[PDB]
Each structure stands twice: as C-alpha cells, then as structure tokens.
Design a protein around this ligand. Sequence first.
Ligand SMILES: CNC(=O)[C@@H](NC(=O)c1ccc(-c2ccc(NC(=O)c3cc4ccccc4o3)cc2)o1)C1CCCCC1
Ligand SMILES: [Ca+2]
Ligand SMILES: [Ca+2]
Ligand SMILES: [Ca+2]
Ligand SMILES: [Ca+2]
Ligand SMILES: [Ca+2]
Ligand SMILES: [Ca+2]
Ligand SMILES: [Zn+2]
Ligand SMILES: [Zn+2]
Ligand SMILES: [Zn+2]
Ligand SMILES: [Zn+2]
Lengths: 160, 165
Amino acid sequence: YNVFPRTLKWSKMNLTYRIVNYTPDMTHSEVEKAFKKAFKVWSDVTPLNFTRLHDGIADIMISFGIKEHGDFYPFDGPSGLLAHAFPPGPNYGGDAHFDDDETWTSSSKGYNLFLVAAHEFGHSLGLDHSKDPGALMFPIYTFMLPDDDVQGIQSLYGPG
Amino acid sequence: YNVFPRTLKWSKMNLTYRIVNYTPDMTHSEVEKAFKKAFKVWSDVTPLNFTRLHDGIADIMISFGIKEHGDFYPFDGPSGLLAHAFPPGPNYGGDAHFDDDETWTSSSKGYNLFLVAAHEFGHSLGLDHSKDPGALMFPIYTYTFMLPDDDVQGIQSLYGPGDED
Ligand SMILES: CNC(=O)[C@@H](NC(=O)c1ccc(-c2ccc(NC(=O)c3cc4ccccc4o3)cc2)o1)C1CCCCC1
Ligand SMILES: [Ca+2]
Ligand SMILES: [Ca+2]
Ligand SMILES: [Ca+2]
Ligand SMILES: [Ca+2]
Ligand SMILES: [Ca+2]
Ligand SMILES: [Ca+2]
Ligand SMILES: [Zn+2]
Ligand SMILES: [Zn+2]
Ligand SMILES: [Zn+2]
Ligand SMILES: [Zn+2]
C-alpha cells in the first residue's frame, strides 16, 4: 500500500521566498519589511535561514489575492479567512496567500500584516494550530515569540 | 503547541458525507446503497464512523459531473478517468468526483459504482495507490467482496484497527 506522507519539515536550513505581488494597502517597502520581520521570528530560534528571490521559483511563494486565486481554497471577501499557507513540501508546499479583501496595515488599522504573516509562516514551517491563547499559532488574531511556539518549532528544526 | 501529522489523515473519527447530486443511470436508492456500502468497507476495519448529511457541508462531498466541474482535473468523456477523490484536508479535502459520462451500475455491465466508490473513498481517507494488482486501491478497474489485506493494513496504519471484532 501507499499513503500520502507529509513533509513534516524542510530538508534544508536555507530557504528562499519570493514576494510575487503586493497589496494596495501598504508601501512595497512596508510589505517587504513585514515579511522579513515575520521570517526573523522563526530564524531567531532555529538554524533556519531565509533569503528572498525577486524572480523565479522560491521555496515560499508569497502572494495576495481575493476569492478564487488559483488553488480552489477561495477567500471570502472581507473578514473571516485572513490568509492561509501550505505545509512544508515541493511545488505548492510552503506558499502563503493573504486575502486582499482584508485591510493590511503596518500597525493596528486593519490586520497587522507582520503578525498574520508570522502566524502563517509557521504553517509554512510545519507548525499546526496551537490551543494556547498566548501562542502566536492560536487561530485567532490579536514582538517576542511565546515559548509555546519556540517549543513547537524547535521540536522540528532544533535550536539556533 | 502542535506539529503536522506524519501523513495525510482525518483528525477525527467521525466524518460526514453528502451526495450532492445523482447520476441518471441508477436510482437515488441504488446510488445511496452503493455509497453506504462503500463507506462500510472502511468503517468495518477502523474506528471511523460515517454519517450522511442531506444538505450543507460534509467532510466528504460526493457529486457526479462531466468535463470541467470545479477543479484542476476535468473528466474526459466516456472511458479513461472514471472518478477521483482528494486526500484528507480542508475545503475539497476528502471530496470524491464521479464522471457522469460513464455508465454506472449496481451490477456488472458498465462500471460498478460500489467498487469504484470503495476505491475512491480509500483516497478520501489518505490512501494512495497500491502496487498489488489485487489491492482495492490498485489504480485499475476490475469487477468481482472482501476488502483485501493490503488495503486493510493500509487504512489501519492511518487510523488503527478500531474494534478488532
Ligand atoms: C477505465 N479507466 C480507468 O480504469 C482509470 N481508473 C480510474 O479513474 C479509477 C478510479 C478508481 C478506480 C478503481 C480501480 C480499482 C478498483 N478495485 C477493483 O476493481 C477491485 C475489486 C476487488 C474485489 C476483491 C478484491 C480486490 C478488488 O479490487 C476500484 C476502482 O479506477 C485508470 C486506468 C488505469 C490508469 C489510470 C486511469
Ligand atoms: Ca477574508
Ligand atoms: Ca513552493
Ligand atoms: Ca483591501
Ligand atoms: Ca471518463
Ligand atoms: Ca471536503
Ligand atoms: Ca451516466
Ligand atoms: Zn490560496
Ligand atoms: Zn493558522
Ligand atoms: Zn473533480
Ligand atoms: Zn485511485
């Protein structure tokens, strides 16, 4: 028999990401900085490293989109699903999509992009949802990575 | 804190299924009996329970369709691909699609909906294809039922035996 193995985690410690498109809600600069920040969250506590490609195929393809945007996990206008990301793996694995019918903001007026991104980037790293309300990976939107997550990611990749 | 499951599988033992529409070939009753039986193949050897919803959103949506029907895998007219289903996961995860350009039957002539369904639902639960030419999860259709042991050992690695009697 065969089942569908899951890529529990990335093989390599060096990962590439590409920001394909941009929300109208923040400067390009602010966006790039929000993601660099969201990757630092997990690079700080693991051997993991993130470098950004400007073209071509990357391990973590980041995009913004609305409704149906090419994977049949369609978004839903404003409110509700803020974003989503695929677990570690080839092809689609690791990719992060952000519902561009939400208002992304580099602060509090809307959903802070960096916060949501850092959350999503755990899903890209193999992290599942947490039930600890203090955990970044808690499903509900609300910087120091909480021990709950530090333990979760380290359990996979180890410390730095 | 939580980490992703080693393999694709359902997080809960209680799963829901909905027959979204029906094929013209067989009656509503034949279609529901074939699917109920198809599900029982798998619940009989695991702790899984399958409940049917008449409307709404189930873990496993079942529908019949032709050519392009709402995903990346269009059907192709008669013969060729008979059907397919997606592995466990959100949205269309676990959903099974049957090509309505085929002839579906509860007998031998045509394609036996029960047998194809049994195989497809295997997919819905996280089984891929076997290499054993006598495994239910063998990719190629053959008419004949006792669930082969490669399939049993396959599903139990995923969800355990349930009650072993
Ligand atoms: C005509 N077109 C096809 O067949 C294409 N098939 C499909 O799309 C497809 C979907 C599901 C099946 C299928 C295959 C085997 C069985 N189980 C059994 O037939 C079975 C019955 C049985 C009874 C006792 C023990 C073991 C058993 O196994 C049940 C269903 O086939 C396929 C062809 C091959 C390449 C890809 C495209
Ligand atoms: Ca939304
Ligand atoms: Ca990718
Ligand atoms: Ca907007
Ligand atoms: Ca066909
Ligand atoms: Ca589904
Ligand atoms: Ca038909
Ligand atoms: Zn998407
Ligand atoms: Zn999440
Ligand atoms: Zn389909
Ligand atoms: Zn198959």
